[PDB]
Amino acid sequence: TTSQKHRDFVAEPMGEKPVGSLAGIGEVLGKKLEERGFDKAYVVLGQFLVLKKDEDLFREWLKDTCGANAKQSRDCFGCLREWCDAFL
Amino acid sequence: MTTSQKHRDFVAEPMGEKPVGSLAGIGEVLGKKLEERGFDKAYVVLGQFLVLKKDEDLFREWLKDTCGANAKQSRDCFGCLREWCDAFL
């Protein structure tokens, strides 16, 4: 299943949406991503793409970068994968 | 229209799984060097462009350092990704 946050994100181009629009990225994770330069959702998309959409490596990178737990990183990965299938 | 037809073709549609050589400025020589470094599809180079927050200087220098792109090649590749993002991201 998916959250409404996921469905809202995968429904449209992301433009300049902030990193907190990504499913799984709440205020805590969002703060830590911004601190490390990932202030917009597209920058995280960038990392997803540099990693060739690899689920294991992206979710691990997210954990190491902002401390995402497994549910959060699952949610974030899934919303980026579905967005790419629709728009990339 | 001062852009190449190859630019226009790239920016006209989602890139899907297009190879890196579909990008403006990326001929066969640059494309091979990019592929050897793991940048085999255009979307991987898009990824680097986005990780660099679409900064022209950073991206064009990364391209130079990674495949030896000259100024014109790196400008064309940057401009093609910038316009693609304006259309589809």
Name its key features.
homodimer; nucleus (chain B); mainly alpha; 88 residues; 64% helix; DNA-binding (chain B); BAF_sf (chain B); globular; BAF_prot (chain B); 5 helices
Summarize the structure in words.
Chain A: Residues 19-34 form the HhH domain. Chain A: This is Barrier-to-autointegration factor. Chain A: Keywords: Acetylation, Chromosome, Cytoplasm, Disease variant, DNA-binding, Host-virus interaction, Nucleus, Osteoporosis, Phosphoprotein. Two copies of one chain form a homodimer. The first copy, chain A, has 88 residues and is mostly helical. Chain A has one domain (1-88). Chain A is 64% helix and 0% strand. The first copy, chain A, has five helices and no strands. Chain A has helices at residues 4-10, 27-35, 41-50, 55-66, 70-87. In chain A, helix 1 packs parallel to helix 5 (70-87) and helix 4 packs across helix 5 (70-87). The longest helix of chain A is centred in the C-terminal third of the chain and has 18 residues, at 70-87. Chain A is globular. The relative contact order of chain A is 0.20. The interface between A and B is medium-sized, with 18 and 18 residues.
Radius of gyration of chain A: 11 Å
Class based on secondary structure composition and strand pairing of chain A:
mainly alpha
Helix and strand pattern of chain A: HHHHH
From the spread of the alpha carbons, the general shape of chain A counts as globular
Number of individual domains of chain A: 1
Cα distance spanning the termini of chain A = 23 Å
Number of strands of chain A: 0
* Multimeric organization: homodimer
Q: Mind summarizing the main beta sheet of chain A?
A: none
Largest interface: A-B, 18 and 18 residues
State the share of residues found in helices of chain A, binned by percent: 55-70%
The DSSP helix count of chain A reads: 5
Quote the beta fraction of chain A. Answer: under 5%
PDB class: dna binding protein
Keywords: minor groove binder, DNA binding protein
Assembly: dimeric
Entry title: Barrier-to-autointegration factor soaked in isobutanol: 1 of 14 in MSCS set
